[PDB]
């Protein structure tokens, strides 16, 4: 049944989008605001008053105070808009290269493992956005590994902190430790912690 | 006297083509030239393949010049903000060996 | 003076000025001679205007801006001073103005 | 306790959301080891050059920086329709 309207111009809408992404900063936020609205209408997650961070009654326990402070250090209060934003960011196009909000952790107390877990969970719930910020999280992980596994950290960093895939897909590791910057996300380099190379 | 003089008798005599003793401004007053890569000012080259004579090198005054200036995009000397993060435990802080 | 060209009633003056300006060795200009942009922001940072100014003051001004631009230190380097006056292993974040 | 609400519901939401008209980039390929975003610019011989993706630092929109800690409320402070009498359309 023929709708009497102009055909949707794929080839033109795509160019206008590229042009907007190049020239118009609001675009990212506009597209996100759609997906967020979608998540909001999909009615999939709702923040609740009852935090469930600790087993009963280890929060009451004296020995656990360091670990409990360590978790309360990370446990953001739920806010609907922030969560909807998280889910949405997972599928929305990125235009300005996303930076990790930096973590200070020095990984002395065992409870510092929490930060690692906060990343592992981020890898799971949001593999994509994690992929954007992964070098920046590799900087925290390296502080972890240098403490918890200094010998392994020695061999690993000795292989190199980054690498570049070449023709035929073989990895070429840097052979040199150096801090990742998001300036590298658009470069040929990858953080080496995620190479999955034995 | 009148070492400082640049021009004289900016008027036109009705009989002779220029007033006796009227003096035009030095050409150097008008050669804006170029800012060099070093930030030194240069008069325009007098021939192809010649570099310009730097303005400070010679005693003529030059009343047009290329000043570099920062734009609205730059801003130096503004206060800037940072997040400061205290060490988690004082006893975990190391001094030596650095 | 070079602006008097083809604009002053005094004929000999405008002839002599037009002559000095038509020399290869001298060439007046007024305005935006050059434009250096950021390598990342792509916005203009340091422009170079041809002002009507004495070459001495232009040379002092240029020495100053050169001192600022060639130092290659930014506001971010201030955190090092902070890191000196704050407890050891304190962390400082952002904003990477560059 | 929360896994169903993720994998069996919110995953469907991601799936359809992926097909939205404006989700126009390929964002990830599931391979952290190899994936890099395809990069484009609008370039002209006359010398313009506008990357579509740039690293400009924290923007006013407030979308660039990522607080990973958002993970915590999601795990330990959020009801889902599939997770909580428990019937819910």
């Amino acid at each position: 049944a023929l709708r009497p309207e102009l055909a949707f111009d794929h080839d033109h809408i795509i160019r206008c989008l590229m042009l907007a992404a190049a020239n118009y900063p609001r675009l990212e936020g506009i597209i996100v605001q759609i997906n967020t609205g979608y998540v909001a209408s999909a009615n999939v997650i709702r923040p609740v008053s009852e935090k469930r961070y600790f087993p009963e009654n280890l929060e009451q326990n004296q020995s656990a105070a360091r670990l409990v402070s360590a978790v309360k250090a990370r446990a953001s209060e739920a806010d609907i808009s922030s969560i909807h934003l998280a889910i949405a960011r997972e599928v929305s196009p990125m235009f300005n290269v996303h930076e990790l909000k930096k973590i200070a952790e020095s990984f002395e107390d065992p409870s510092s493992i929490v930060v690692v877990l906060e990343f592992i969970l981020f890898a799971l719930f949001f593999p994509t956005e994690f992929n954007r910020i992964k070098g920046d999280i590799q900087n925290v992980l390296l502080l972890f590994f240098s403490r918890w596994y200094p010998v392994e950290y020695g061999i690993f960093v000795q292989r190199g902190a980054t690498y570049t895939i070449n023709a035929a897909g073989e990895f070429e590791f840097s052979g040199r430790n150096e801090k990742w910057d998001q300036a590298l996300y658009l470069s040929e380099h990858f953080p080496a912690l995620f190479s999955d190379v034995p | 006297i009148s070492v400082a003089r640049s021009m004289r008798a900016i008027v036109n005599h009705n009989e002779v083509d220029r007033p006796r003793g009227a003096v035009a401004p030095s050409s150097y007053e008008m050669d804006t030239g170029t800012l060099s890569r070093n930030g030194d000012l240069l008069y325009s080259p007098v021939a192809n393949g010649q570099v310009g004579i730097p303005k400070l090198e010679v005693d003529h005054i030059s009343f047009s010049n290329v000043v570099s200036m920062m734009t609205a995009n730059i801003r130096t000397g503004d206060d800037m903000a940072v997040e400061r993060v205290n060490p988690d435990d004082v006893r975990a802080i190391n001094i030596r060996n650095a | 003076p070079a602006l008097l060209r083809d604009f002053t009633q005094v004929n000999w003056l405008n002839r002599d000025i037009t002559n000095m300006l038509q020399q290869a060795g001298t060439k007046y200009g007024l305005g935006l001679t050059e434009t250096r942009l950021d390598y990342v922001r792509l916005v203009k940072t340091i422009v170079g205007h041809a002002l009507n100014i004495d070459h001495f003051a232009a040379s002092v001004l240029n020495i100053n801006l050169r001192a600022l631009m060639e130092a290659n230190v930014t506001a971010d380097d201030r955190i090092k001073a902070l890191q000196a006056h704050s407890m050891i292993s304190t962390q400082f974040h952002g904003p990477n103005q560059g | 306790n929360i896994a169903v609400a993720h994998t069996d519901h919110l995953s469907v939401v991601y799936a359809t959301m992926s097909n939205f008209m404006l989700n126009f980039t390929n964002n990830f390929s599931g391979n952290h080891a190899t994936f890099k975003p395809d990069q484009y610019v609008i370039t002209s011989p006359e010398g313009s050059y506008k990357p579509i993706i740039e690293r400009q630092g924290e923007t006013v929109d407030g979308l660039t920086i990522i607080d990973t800690s958002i993970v915590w409320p999601i795990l330990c402070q959020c009801t889902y329709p599939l997770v909580r009498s428990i019937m819910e359309e």
Binding site: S76 | D79, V82, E83 | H93, G94, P95 | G62, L63
Partner: peptide
């Protein structure tokens, strides 16, 4: 505590 996507700035270095 609260989620905040921006940098949580809290001091001002002088020039």
């Amino acid at each position: 505590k609260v989620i905040f996507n921006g940098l949580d700035v809290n001091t001002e270095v002088q020039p």
